[PDB]
């Protein structure tokens, strides 16, 4: 029973998982894959137990029977009376970020520009923006909208990968894992910060966490929030301080998923695990902290306060919501009930 196998995506999450495994006295063990899709297959096969996912993948994993167990919960101002684990999730804001110095660039003049996406199939980095674009465009040719981009998970030979850089030696170009320089929230923001792309599709928090001395990372040390602007749907540009009134959509928090027949056992282990390495864990600051990885968001976003119970034992459809689910469906129509394997 009680031993849980976690699936790490890429060499960086593997090493973090191994530390976790070590400190957990084998209560947690690691399996590794080169992509989130592969990890999902390992979980379906039962060679793995769970992994934390972005809404976009939860849709995929859901169709194949996997279920949401616990969701990430970040520190919020409202609902302060309830404990983190019992507190309702609020979701994150999907935004489009651009350089202020790139005057004249608005949501209505994105065509033929350069884009930076977290990775194909993710919420803020792909489903939301590309979905809105396919609608407003009335075409399924989202592979021709931008001139060049870096969208991890696309054909390496396509313009959708043209801007990706791969690893320190140039290998793994465009792979959907942290080996790729511009992968995920941080990678997509860096892609913008280094003026590789004209626009980055990440989440509100990504801009705050990597500006004004919050990162210390060689490429973000001198980044100032004021040099950035948010593209709203009404064609307007606003400061990153107005995200509540200028976002593309609100996305459901990343959540841990396992097979339905194992969720109970995974839920038990995780709660006890975070009691030890969580934010105010018995051994987090001193020995190991599940939610830290120096702005790299490994296994879990670095801004996670705790993993929270769901309440209402929601199916994957109920967890993502009808709004979002229909959006992905309509966008999928471009690339009707299935399980991709």
Ligand X SMILES: OC[C@H]1O[C@@](CO)(O[C@H]2O[C@H](CO)[C@@H](O)[C@H](O)[C@H]2O)[C@@H](O)[C@@H]1O
Ligand Y SMILES: *[C@@H]1O[C@H](CO)[C@@H](O[C@@H]2O[C@H](CO)[C@@H](O[C@@H]3O[C@H](CO[C@H]4O[C@H](CO)[C@@H](O)[C@H](O)[C@@H]4O)[C@@H](O[C@@H]4O[C@H](CO)[C@@H](O)[C@H](O)[C@@H]4O)[C@H](O)[C@@H]3O)[C@H](O)[C@H]2NC(C)=O)[C@H](O)[C@H]1NC(C)=O
Ligand Z SMILES: *[C@@H]1O[C@H](CO)[C@@H](O[C@@H]2O[C@H](CO)[C@@H](O[C@@H]3O[C@H](CO)[C@@H](O[C@@H]4O[C@H](CO)[C@@H](O[C@H]5O[C@H](CO)[C@@H](O[C@@H]6O[C@H](CO)[C@@H](O)[C@H](O)[C@@H]6O)[C@H](O)[C@@H]5O)[C@H](O)[C@@H]4O)[C@H](O)[C@@H]3O)[C@H](O)[C@H]2NC(C)=O)[C@H](O)[C@H]1NC(C)=O
Ligand U SMILES: *[C@@H]1O[C@H](CO)[C@@H](O[C@@H]2O[C@H](CO)[C@@H](O)[C@H](O)[C@H]2NC(C)=O)[C@H](O)[C@H]1NC(C)=O
Pick from 213, 326, 340, 341 the residue near ligand Y by CB under 6 A: 326
Note whether 319 binds ligand X by CB under 6 A.
yes
Note whether 321 binds ligand X by CB under 6 A.
yes
Please provide the DSSP assignment of 190-238 as one string.
Answer: HHHHTTSSSEEEEEHHHHHHTSTTS---TTTTT--GGGEEEEPTTS-EE
Distances (CA, A) of 134 to 268, 322, 331: 42, 19, 7
Which part of the chain contacts ligand Z (CB under 6 A), choosing from 74-82, 256-264, 269-277, 306-314? Answer: 74-82
Residue 220: which residues within 8 A CB-CB, separation 6 or more?
190, 193, 210, 211, 214, 295
Q: Which of 121, 144, 143, 129 is nearest to 247 (CA)?
A: 129
Q: Between residue 17 and residue 46, which ones bind ligand U under the rule CB under 6 A?
A: 24-25, 27
Please tell me whether 54 is known to bind a ligand.
Answer: yes
Provide the minimum distance between the beta carbon of 239 and ligand Y in the complex, in angstroms, as a whole number.
25
**Residue span 285-324 as binding mask against ligand Z, x where in contact by CB under 6 A, dash where not:** ------------------x---------------------
> Which of 55/278 has CB closer to Fe ion?
55
In this structure, are residues 307 and 270 in contact, taking their beta carbons and an 8 Å threshold? yes
Note whether 312 binds ligand U by CB under 6 A.
no
Counts for the chain of helices (H) and strands (E), in that order: 9, 13
Note whether 276 binds ligand U by CB under 6 A.
yes
Please tell me whether 241 is known to bind a ligand.
Answer: no
Please tell me whether 117 is known to bind a ligand.
Answer: no
Q: Sign of the CA dihedral 82, 85, 90, 95?
A: positive
Please tell me whether 316 is known to bind a ligand.
Answer: no
DSSP state, residue 303? T
Note whether 330 binds ligand Y by CB under 6 A.
yes
Degrees to nearest 5, angle at CA 279 with 24 and 60: 75
Note whether 131 binds ligand Y by CB under 6 A.
yes
Residue 123 binds which of ligand Y, Fe ion, Zn ion, none (CB < 5-8 A, kind-dependent): Fe ion
Q: Where on the chain is the footprint of ligand Y (CB under 6 A)?
A: 131-132, 135, 323, 326-327, 330
Q: Known binding site: residues?
A: 54, 92, 118, 122, 124-125, 185, 254
> Which residues of the chain form contacts with ligand X (CB under 6 A)?
312, 314, 317-319, 321-323
């Amino acid at each position: 029973y009680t031993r849980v196998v976690w699936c790490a995506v890429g060499p960086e999450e593997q090493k973090k998982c191994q530390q976790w495994s070590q400190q957990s006295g084998q209560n947690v063990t690691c399996a590794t894959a080169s992509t989130t899709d592969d990890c999902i297959v390992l979980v379906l096969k039962g060679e793995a137990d769970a992994l934390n996912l972005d809404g976009g993948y939860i849709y995929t994993a859901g169709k194949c029977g996997l279920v949401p167990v616990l969701a990430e919960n970040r520190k919020s101002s409202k609902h302060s009376s309830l404990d983190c684990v019992l507190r309702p999730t609020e979701g994150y804001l999907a935004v489009a970020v651009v350089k202020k110095a790139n005057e004249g660039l608005t949501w209505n003049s994105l065509k033929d520009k350069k884009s930076c996406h977290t990775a194909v199939d993710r919420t803020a980095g792909w489903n939301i923006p590309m979905g809105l674009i396919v609608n407003q465009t009335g075409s399924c040719a989202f592979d021709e909208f931008f001139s060049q981009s870096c969208a991890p998970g696309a054909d390496p030979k396509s313009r959708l990968c043209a801007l990706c850089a791969g690893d320190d030696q140039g290998l793994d170009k465009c792979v959907p894992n942290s080996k790729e320089k511009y992968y995920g929230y941080t990678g997509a923001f860096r892609c913008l910060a280094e003026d590789v792309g004209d626009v980055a599709f990440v989440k509100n928090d990504t801009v705050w966490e990597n500006t004004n001395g919050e990162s210390t990372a060689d490429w973000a040390k001198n980044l100032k929030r004021e040099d950035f602007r948010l593209l709203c749907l009404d064609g307007t540009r606003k400061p990153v301080t107005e995200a509540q009134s200028c976002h593309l959509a609100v996305a459901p928090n990343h959540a841990v998923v396992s097979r339905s027949d194992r969720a109970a056992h995974v839920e038990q282990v995780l709660l006890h695990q975070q009691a030890l390495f969580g934010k105010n864990g018995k051994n987090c600051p001193d020995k190991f902290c599940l939610f830290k990885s120096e702005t790299k968001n490994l296994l879990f976003n670095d801004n996670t306060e705790c993993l929270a119970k769901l309440g209402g034992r929601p199916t994957y459809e109920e967890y993502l919501g009808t709004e979002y689910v229909t959006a992905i469906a309509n966008l999928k129509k471009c690339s009707l009930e299935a399980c991709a394997f």
